[PDB]
Design a protein around this nucleic acid. Structure first.
Ligand SMILES: Nc1ccn([C@@H]2O[C@H](COP(=O)(O)OP(=O)(O)OP(=O)(O)O)[C@@H](O)[C@H]2O)c(=O)n1
Ligand SMILES: [Mg+2]
Ligand SMILES: [Mg+2]
Ligand SMILES: [Zn+2]
Lengths: 615, 1052, 98, 85, 98
RNA sequence: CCGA
DNA sequence: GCTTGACAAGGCCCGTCCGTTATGGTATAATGGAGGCTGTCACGGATGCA
């Protein structure tokens, strides 16, 4: 569907339970994971309450219950009365999530051990003190009533608390430890009262205190605008990811391939069930206190492994990948699967040089082209009445036929193809070409587009991509075709220009050479006369040649406009001499003729320019 | 000397003396009751014969191992019960005659690791500008590190590996030394007594209580046992032989070498040196100097892994003795060999040091065994690799080659041992030098082999100084290196000189002729490409070489070398028989068309005939990239440095068809295919001839069991092994149900699972070995039978193949011309290859023109020259004068005077093959030695329409082996965004990856010729949404429409 | 582009907040039409990493760098992403708005 | 999972199957469609066709038998014969 | 050091990240400078006096810095010493002056 | 480990 | 264009039947853990300490 915006917030326990709970027609919710079992070892089926359970997450097969008896497709939207598994398609295990109901409150490690550690900001305490209370190393005073030596949010050791028990003072003094104390401290904080106290405190305070008051006030003002409670930073319910995002597949050899998220959830469920067992049978407090600290360290390793304490490792002391580790890095979800993907209808090969081949044309190998254009060939083989379905078309494509090559030749005509060479440092690293079928295995590249790709022919490979839609073919032709990409986008200067052999060939063609002077100083009646004399073998390539040429757009090295000498002729005619020109003009208002000293190679160069441009 | 002598000497030291030290530090063990004692007799340990040899272990995917039996003896403390029994202790893989190991059917080498040597090291770190403060570090072979400190006030602070700083007087009184001998041992007691007051002076009992307060109920007996267990106990602290040697050397002690523990005299001497360094006497150490770095080969690493496994084994034996109250056991019941086998298998399988072997050619095989890597366990981390550890040190001169190094991210980390280098008994690299007396190079006896004893002491000259024969060093200035500085001195002050001008370089760099006329990066590229050449069908020796080719071919191990004098009596293509004379027939087996690790050929050919005398050391058979007993990696072909019609434009290569029809550059590649008939829960997989949906003539090459025969031709898609598996779901859609209602069509219970040839990969079947458990074999568990198929193919030269010379001049063939179109010489001979002349002066590899001109002179003479590098010691312009003089002498032949022109020396006239006209300028022709590399176009071409997908992301896979797609990374997305092209980018991200309904709809619309519909939400975004929800974040998408907000369901 | 706020008089802009100067000027004019006391500011210069993380979109800032901190401050501030830019529509799967 | 090629092949097979079946008599076409679930997604027995109609299940088996015999004709039915694997 | 892009590109990165270099000292008003130097033996302090105010400002200078001012009309953000300028101080000086 |  | 009767085939369904599986227990005395770092560099906050 369509949506307009995405909003992020803090999840309440009722919202986490709302993601996981699903009701049955009998009147029973099924969303809670209570056992750390995954699948049965004998038959490879998921267990009836666990991390892969079919009552919570859905069936493993399409339209089939767990216990049997509903194997057909005809029972749709029904729930089995014996087992409890809804007879649905098996792709709901990508979406359906569950939850774990904790026996003790736990803190989210993102809000405690981050920077700037919003829990200690909102609680107005130091980070080491809150980290000492949460991990059961110190107490805190929740009720400071009837004491002068005790105050609110004051930390005590175990010795200081057992020596307070000497006085049994003579009133009700409460203490707390763990995330229960933090949840009770956050639950009794009146947000509007602390906000108006901070606004009444900032106007009359010091300099460095005021920045801390501004930071606490701007943290507190977010909790009133979002209408979220401060005690939601401590977790009572833990959401469980769907089982198809933590898959457990079997390799050829009998060994199972698991993901690291199953071990972390298994540790959380094991320590939760042991904590419930210890609280049921009234164990001593040193054993129940170590079990709550271990559950606290288990939830933190599932969320962010190695953020606070020791990193939980696996088999070869490799750290387990957690819920933030699968998204937070350059191998995470954003940089590896969302901003860049692997694509269909693509291939690659080594590149060779492509002379006697135009620009906007790439040489595409034939065995590469039957694979990339396979559904377009399959469509044409049915439209021409050769075959009738996809199976006969695929059979004739793989078996080899001379009909397939003519079909592919008439299919790839006018279909542009994008070429790419890594690294793609700028825009000209992806350009579109019109393919022609070459024989061999390398891709033939035109030599003028090689500085745009930074590509030479000593081992470079290029990827090939085929646009499918008609909007995608019109965009490859009108916006990305290689004959429209002459100018750079960084400067205004042309990228497509001769280089490294055409420059040397044009330098040799138009140079001066005193050794090769055959027929030097001869007079010719224009450009075509000297071009005919060169192909007849009359002159050399660097001979000094006078050319009758009436145009005045002549540019030379160190351009001359001054007259060297003048020889006067009869009938009022002046013969003006230049360094590389000879102009005969009339007396008053006319020019008669003009000769230019040049080489035949310069004449070849200018004839090439003139027949290339004016057409 | 041999070139793989470090591998051979280290494994011989392990088999002779290294394991005995572990078995002697092992014994004896005892129980906690003190009534049983088990001790291992290590000196008489036995080795069983291997179950299979080299080739039968290679083809069975097994190891080449021996069984190791250590005889034990159980003595009894209640009565005179002596129980002696041979006990199996583990499986040790044996080093082959080439210096390699065979682990799971693959050849493997254990590369040499360079680490910091044990001993005491001092450094001088400082503040902003602050005080010159000095710090010590005592490094053992194994155990805790003892460090020392000085601050700006001057406090001597000692610390253990991770702890905070405490005082050296507290450590010294914690040992048990008197305060008398502490300040009576020191040279300057006034500096130490300054720290005595601020830190205080404890008693012997008062000091033991305050280390336990810092290292960890503070007790003195617990801290005494703690420090006795850290530094002074065996089997928890080993200083090592090299550590004792270097610590006696630095601190000038004559302590006995048998003591391998730390003593308080050593700590007193280290305190004395650290205090004396604050009064400007003594020398601070260098961490990158090759006197402080040693090489650990395969003996030490096996010794350490066996130590760890024996620690586990004796823990198991002590637990089994302490639990069992009943006595009178057998020694074979108390020994569990499984941790030692597990440790040895872990070391040989999953180590950074145990590397998959480079077996492309003999040069790559020889170079891989001499690699010196700084990475690994106990070495370095690539993230902790700065610039100074990748720099070239002056102590590397002669010992480590400055040229040969990787070009990738591990540049400067993995080095190569130089040619004349050698590792001594303590692990340090030494180089031979000739003595120089009164300005005369001595050269009378063996050289000295200085182990970096030549920096602070000797003036060493290189081996390219001019010197008249049987005489002094000519010239009044000799270039020397001294105190890690280059300088020039008189010849009467020179102490040592090098023995060879190629002492600075490795073997593959010494293969390059005219090396001093090339750039160093191009020499690196030439060495790297020389290690990547494929062995050709008819190998040929170079017309210009250097001289190390025969020794490289002898020490690679691909050459059958004779051992005795004798007369060869019988030679065929598989066997050479010779009776020795100076159990009277030596049979040398000759291997025929075996497969290397890189799918190349390992073939040997006989050279000797029947009935001729044979000297020991004579080459009897030569290998795949070897002919005439010398290394032969490529062929000699006729070059012309000229541009064609854009066909050698930007390092492209134009060749002729003569290199195709004359079988030049034709190589053999053998591929290997393996299939297992596994055991499934639904039934056993069987290998059969009856396959469903397979026609009539697709089974001609299969035998009666469904397997191909030897000598059959296979192409892409042909069946190699027919296999079926019993599918058992049988969930058919209504379309298939109606189509089987109409036309009969009984659906079978098995499905096709046959082994087929991949796309391409045609060839001939040469080996169809089948392994079955009831034939005597034993398999991986869960597999009934295993079939292994070897397919060989002859690959000719092709457009798109890579081609290179010895000077870093690579290139891709882009056109193959006929010989009537190739340019030709004034005797009518056409050119084999045209190279672009613009690739020479920009890349600055001038030695290829020297090599081609000298090879062409040797072609016109017929002499096969050999020139050592750095030949300018014999005069100015020596290479140029040699080349042009030999070209003149080749042109003085009675029929060949067109070979050399005195007006333009290196060039002659070349005619065009198409028109007959000569080119306008003379062209440099020659005979170059070109190579064919492993990078062929058949292994590079790949294409995908639609294949498999990933598990969670549901995006296409990657890789050629799994029909994967190309990655359209983030830079390509930026390039498409810098254009317009919003629709190309949208179809690249949705209907070509991880949108399954869009995939099906796009394929159906293309096949039926209609418009492709609009895509939906991609699959990986929903995965990200579920992951962010499972982290505990209430993230949701919303939609606004006519004054209404509603949460949208993206899972739909 | 940005500016730092101090003297937060009669405005919903606490000190320390990085706002664009055009937005502070629009708020100052549209509250100076009511004759109220405006907000002072001092201009700041950010680097290319701090200006990338101080954008209005948490999806782009989370996909760029420091995903945990950006997602924590976005979850506590309760902010919305209105999908205005090239990087968000690539992640969503839509046509880019260029 | 199932490839997009198998999806498009079975969809073209479904379209060609419906276009072949709607050429014969309208009664036998829907009998064959309700028999194998080409419209309901539920394969039914012979009697429940007799409750869709009221004529009982013995005529239904003869109807589907002669419909299969008409679709098994060699002439004008080989468009579906290429899907034979 | 050597001149190539390996040494020029860290300058680009520290310019685009708006970092602060080690040595920098700019003016804080727009005065009319007249140089006074008595002894250059590792002790130089630059004297400069304004036009509008009676109280003058003379920026003190530690010995490793030098002087580039030879006498001109010094404006607000002018650089008096040698060293890499930081744009934070330029923005601060201009805003605090105007 | 190598290639661009 | 249907209809009734014979001949079998095969899913549901409720008994035993034996292999698997969960659970409880064992009585000399035993009472604080092995096990690696120790060669990267630079910047920005956040303590923390004199
Ligand atoms: N670590 C590397 C190495 C190489 N490249 C790419 O590969 C090309 C390497 O070109 P190559 O042909 O290997 O070397 P040249 O620069 O052409 O030099 P030469 O002709 O001497 O080989 C570079 O332009 C670069 O774009 C890269 O992206 N990353
Ligand atoms: Mg290249
Ligand atoms: Mg190149
Ligand atoms: Zn059921």
């Amino acid at each position: 569907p369509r949506f307009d915006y995405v909003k992020i917030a803090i999840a309440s326990p009722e919202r986490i339970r709302q993601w996981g709970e699903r009701t049955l027609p009998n009147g029973t919710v099924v969303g809670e994971v209570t056992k750390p079992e995954t699948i049965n070892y004998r038959t490879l089926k998921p267990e009836m309450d666990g991390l892969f359970c079919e009552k919570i997450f859905g069936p493993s097969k399409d339209w089939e219950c767990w216990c049997g008896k509903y194997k057909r497709v005809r029972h749709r939207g029904i729930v089995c009365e014996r087992c409890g598994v809804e007879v649905t398609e098996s792709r709901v295990r990508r979406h359906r999530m569950g939850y774990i109901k904790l026996a003790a409150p736990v803190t989210h490690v993102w809000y405690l051990k981050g920077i700037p550690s919003y829990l200690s900001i909102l609680l107005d305490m130091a980070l080491r003190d809150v980290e000492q209370i949460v991990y059961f190393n110190a107490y805190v005073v929740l009720n400071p009533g009837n004491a002068s030596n005790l105050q609110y949010k004051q930390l005590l050791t175990e010795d200081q608390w057992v020596e307070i028990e000497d006085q049994i003072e003579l009133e009700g003094i409460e203490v707390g430890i763990g995330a229960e104390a933090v949840q009770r401290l956050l639950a009794e904080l009146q947000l509007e009262e602390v906000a108006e106290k901070l606004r009444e405190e900032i106007l009359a305070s010091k300099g460095q205190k005021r920045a801390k008051l501004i930071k606490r006030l701007r943290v507190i003002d977010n909790f009133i605008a979002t209408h979220s409670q401060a005690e939601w930073m401590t977790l009572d319910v833990i959401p469980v990811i769907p089982p198809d995002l933590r898959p457990m597949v079997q390799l050829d050899g009998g060994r199972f391939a698991t993901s690291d998220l199953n071990d972390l959830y298994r540790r959380v469920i094991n320590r939760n069930n042991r904590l419930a067992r210890l609280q049921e049978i009234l164990a001593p407090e040193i054993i129940v206190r170590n079990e709550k600290r271990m559950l606290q360290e288990a939830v933190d390793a599932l969320i962010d492994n190695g953020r606070r304490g020791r990193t939980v490792v696996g088999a070869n002391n490799r750290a387990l990948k957690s819920l933030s580790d699968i998204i937070e890095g350059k191998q995470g979800r954003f940089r590896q699967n969302l901003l860049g993907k692997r694509v269909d209808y693509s291939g690659r090969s080594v590149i060779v040089v492509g002379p006697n081949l135009k620009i906007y044309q790439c040489g595409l190998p034939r065995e590469m082209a039957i694979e990339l254009f396979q559904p377009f060939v399959i469509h044409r083989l049915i439209k021409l009445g050769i075959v009738n379905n996809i199976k006969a078309a695929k059979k004739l494509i793989l078996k080899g036929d001379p009909q397939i090559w003519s079909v592919l030749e008439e299919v790839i005509t006018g279909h542009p193809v994008m070429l790419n060479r890594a690294p793609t440092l700028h825009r000209l690293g992806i350009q579109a070409f019109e393919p022609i079928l070459v024989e061999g295995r390398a891709i033939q590249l035109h030599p003028l587009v090689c500085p745009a790709f930074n590509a030479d022919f000593d081992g470079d490979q290029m990827a090939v991509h085929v646009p499918l839609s008609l909007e995608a073919q019109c965009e490859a032709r009108l916006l990305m075709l290689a004959c429209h990409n002459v100018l750079s986008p960084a400067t205004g200067k042309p990228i497509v220009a001769p280089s490294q052999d055409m420059v040397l060939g044009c330098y040799y063609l138009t140079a001066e050479n005193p050794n090769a002077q055959k027929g030097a100083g001869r007079y010719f009646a224009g450009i075509e006369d000297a071009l005919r004399a060169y192909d007849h073998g009359q002159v050399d390539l660097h001979s000094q040649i006078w050319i009758r040429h009436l145009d005045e757009d002549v540019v030379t090295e160190k351009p001359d406009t001054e007259v060297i000498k003048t020889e006067d002729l009869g009938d009022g005619t002046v013969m003006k001499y230049y360094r590389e020109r000879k102009i005969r003009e009339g007396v008053d208002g006319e020019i008669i003729t003009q000769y230019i000293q040049t080489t035949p190679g310069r004449i070849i160069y200018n004839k090439t320019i003139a027949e290339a441009l004016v057409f | 000397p041999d070139l793989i002598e470090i591998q051979h000497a280290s494994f011989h030291w392990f088999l002779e003396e290294g394991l005995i030290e572990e078995l002697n530090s092992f014994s004896p063990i005892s129980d906690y009751t003190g009534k049983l004692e088990l001790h291992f007799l290590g000196k008489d340990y036995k080795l069983k014969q291997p179950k299979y040899d080299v080739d039968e272990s290679k083809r069975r995917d097994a190891s080449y191992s021996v069984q190791m039996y250590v005889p034990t003896r159980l003595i009894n403390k209640e009565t005179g019960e002596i129980k002696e029994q041979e006990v199996f202790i583990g499986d040790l893989p044996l080093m082959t005659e080439r210096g390699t190991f065979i682990i799971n059917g693959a050849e493997r080498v254990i590369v040499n690791q360079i680490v910091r040597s044990p001993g005491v090291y001092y450094k001088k770190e400082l503040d902003k500008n602050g005080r010159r403060t000095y710090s010590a570090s005592l490094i053992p072979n194994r155990g805790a590190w003892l460090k020392f400190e000085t601050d700006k006030n001057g406090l001597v602070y000692v610390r253990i590996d991770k702890t905070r700083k405490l005082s050296a007087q507290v450590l010294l009184k914690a040992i048990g030394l008197s305060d008398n001998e502490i300040l009576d041992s020191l040279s300057h007691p006034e500096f130490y007594q300054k720290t005595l007051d601020k830190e205080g002076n404890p008693t012997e009992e008062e000091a033991l209580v305050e280390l336990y307060k810092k290292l960890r109920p503070p007790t003195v007996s617990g801290g005494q046992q703690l420090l006795e267990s850290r530094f002074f106990d065996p089997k928890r602290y080993d200083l090592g032989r090299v550590g004792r040697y270097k610590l006696n050397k630095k601190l000038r002690l004559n302590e006995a070498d048998t003591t391998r523990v730390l003593t308080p005299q050593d700590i007193l001497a280290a305190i004395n040196y650290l205090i004396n360094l604050e009064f400007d006497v003594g020398t601070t150490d260098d961490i990158d100097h090759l006197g402080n770095r040693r090489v650990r080969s395969v003996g030490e690493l096996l010794q350490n892994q066996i130590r760890v496994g024996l620690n586990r084994l004796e823990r198991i034996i002590r637990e089994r003795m302490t639990v069992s109250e009943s006595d009178a056991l057998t020694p074979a019941s108390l020994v569990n060999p499984k941790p030692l086998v597990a440790a040895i298998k872990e070391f040989f399988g999953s180590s950074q040091l145990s590397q998959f072997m480079d077996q492309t050619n003999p040069l790559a095989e020889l170079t891989h065994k001499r690699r010196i890597s700084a990475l690994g366990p106990g070495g370095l981390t690539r993230e902790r690799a700065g610039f100074a550890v990748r720099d070239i040190h002056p102590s590397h001169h002669g010992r480590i080659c400055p040229v040969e190094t990787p070009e990738g991210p591990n540049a400067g980390l993995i080095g190569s041992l130089a040619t004349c280098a050698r590792v001594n008994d303590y692990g340090f690299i030494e180089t031979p030098y000739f003595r120089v007396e009164s300005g005369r190079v001595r050269k009378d006896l063996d050289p000295v082999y200085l182990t970096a004893d030549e920096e602070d002491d000797m003036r060493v000259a290189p081996g390219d100084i001019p010197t008249d024969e049987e005489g002094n060093i000519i010239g009044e200035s000799v270039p020397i290196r001294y105190r890690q500085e280059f300088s020039t001195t008189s010849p009467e002050q020179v102490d040592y000189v090098a023995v060879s001008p190629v002492q600075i370089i490795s073997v593959a760099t010494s293969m390059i002729p005219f090396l001093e006329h090339d750039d160093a990066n191009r020499a690196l590229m030439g060495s790297n490409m020389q290690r990547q050449a494929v062995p050709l069908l008819r190998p040929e020796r170079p017309l210009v070489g250097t001289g190390l080719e025969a020794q490289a071919a002898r020490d690679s191990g691909m050459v059958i070398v004779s051992r005795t004098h004798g007369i060869v009596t019988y030679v065929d293509a598989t066997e050479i028989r010779v009776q020795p004379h100076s159990g009277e027939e030596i049979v040398y087996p000759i291997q025929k068309y075996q497969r290397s690790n890189q799918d190349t050929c390992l073939n040997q050919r006989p050279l000797v005939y029947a009935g001729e005398d044979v000297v020991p050391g004579q080459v009897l058979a030569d290998g795949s990239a070897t002919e005439g007993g010398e290394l032969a990696l490529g062929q000699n072909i006729l070059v012309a440095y000229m541009p064609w019609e854009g066909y050698n434009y930007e390092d492209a290569i134009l060749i002729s068809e003569r290199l195709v029809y004359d079988d030049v550059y034709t190589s053999i590649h053998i591929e290997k295919f393996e299939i297992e008939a596994r055991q499934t829960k639904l039934g056993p997989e069987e290998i059969t001839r009856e396959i469903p949906n397979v026609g009539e003539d697709a089974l001609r090459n299969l035998d009666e069991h469904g397997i191909i025969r030897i000598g059959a031709w296979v192409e892409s898609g042909d069946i190699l092994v027919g296999k079926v598996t019993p599918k058992g779901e049988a969930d058919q859609p209504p379309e298939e149900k109606l189509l089987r209602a109409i036309f009969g069509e009984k659906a079978r219970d098995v499905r096709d699972n046959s082994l087929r040839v991949p796309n391409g990969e045609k060839g001939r079947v040469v080996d169809v070995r089948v392994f079955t458990r009831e034939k005597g074999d034993e398999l991986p568990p869960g597999a009934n039978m295993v079939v292994r198929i070897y397919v060989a193919q002859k690959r000719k030269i092709q457009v798109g193949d890579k081609m290179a010379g010895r000077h870093g001049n690579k290139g891709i063939i882009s056109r193959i011309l006929p010989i009537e179109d190739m340019p030709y010489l004034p005797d009518g001979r056409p050119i084999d290859i045209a190279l672009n002349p613009l690739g020479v002066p920009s890349r600055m590899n001038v030695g290829q023109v020297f090599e081609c001109l000298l090879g062409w002179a040797g072609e016109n003479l017929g002499v096969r020259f050999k020139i050592t590098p750095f030949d300018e010691m014999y005069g100015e312009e020596a290479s140029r004068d040699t080349v042009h003089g030999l070209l003149e002498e080749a042109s003085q032949r009675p029929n060949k005077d067109w070979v050399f022109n005195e007006n333009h020396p290196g060039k002659i006239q070349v005619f065009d093959g198409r028109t007959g006209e000569p080119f306008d300028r003379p062209i440099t022709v020659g005979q170059a030695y070109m190579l064919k590399l492993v990078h062929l176009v058949d292994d590079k071409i790949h294409a995908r329409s639609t294949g498999p997908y990933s598990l969670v992301t549901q995006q296409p896979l990657g890789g050629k082996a799994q029909q994967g797609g190309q990655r359209f990374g983030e830079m390509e997305v930026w390039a498409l965004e810098a254009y317009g092209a919003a629709y190309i980018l949208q179809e690249l991200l949705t209907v070509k990856s991880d949108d399954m309904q869009g995939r099906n709809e796009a394929l159906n619309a293309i096949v039926k010729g209609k418009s492709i519909p609009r895509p939906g939400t991609p699959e990986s975004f929903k995965v990200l949404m579920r992951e962010l929800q499972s982290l505990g974040l209430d993230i949701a998408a919303h939609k606004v429409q006519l004054s209404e907000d509603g949460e949208s369901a993206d899972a739909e | 582009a940005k500016v730092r706020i101090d003297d937060g008089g009669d405005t919903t802009m606490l000190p320390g907040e990085l706002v664009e100067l055009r937005q502070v000027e629009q708020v100052n004019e549209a509250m100076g039409i009511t004759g109220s006391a405006p907000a002072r500011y001092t201009p700041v210069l950010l680097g290319i990493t701090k200006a990338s993380l101080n954008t209005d979109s948490f999806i782009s800032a989370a996909s760029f760098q420091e995903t945990t901190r950006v997602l924590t401050e976005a979850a506590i501030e309760g902010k919305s992403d209105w999908l205005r830019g090239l990087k968000e529509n690539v992640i969503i799967g839509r046509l880019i708005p260029a | 999972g199932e490839t997009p090629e198998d999806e498009v092949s079975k969809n073209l097979l479904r379209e060609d199957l419906e276009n072949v079946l709607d050429t014969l008599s309208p009664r036998e076409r829907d009998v064959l469609r309700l028999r194998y679930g080409l419209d309901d997604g539920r394969m039914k027995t012979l009697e429940e066709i007799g409750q869709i109609f009221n004529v009982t299940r013995e005529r239904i088996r003869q109807i589907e038998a002669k419909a299969l015999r008409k679709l098994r004709h060699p002439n004008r039915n080989s468009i579906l014969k290429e899907y034979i694997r | 050091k050597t001149g190539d892009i390996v040494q020029g590109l860290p300058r680009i990165e520290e310019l685009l990240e708006a970092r602060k270099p080690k040595e920098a000292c700019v003016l804080a008003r727009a005065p009319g400078v007249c140089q006074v130097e008595y002894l250059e033996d590792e002790s130089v302090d630059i004297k400069v006096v304004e036009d509008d105010g009676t109280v003058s400002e003379y920026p003190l200078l530690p010995g490793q810095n030098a002087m580039v001012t030879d006498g001109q009309r010094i404006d607000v953000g002018h650089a008096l010493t040698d060293g890499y300028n930081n744009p934070h101080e330029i923005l601060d000086v201009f805003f605090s002056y105007y």
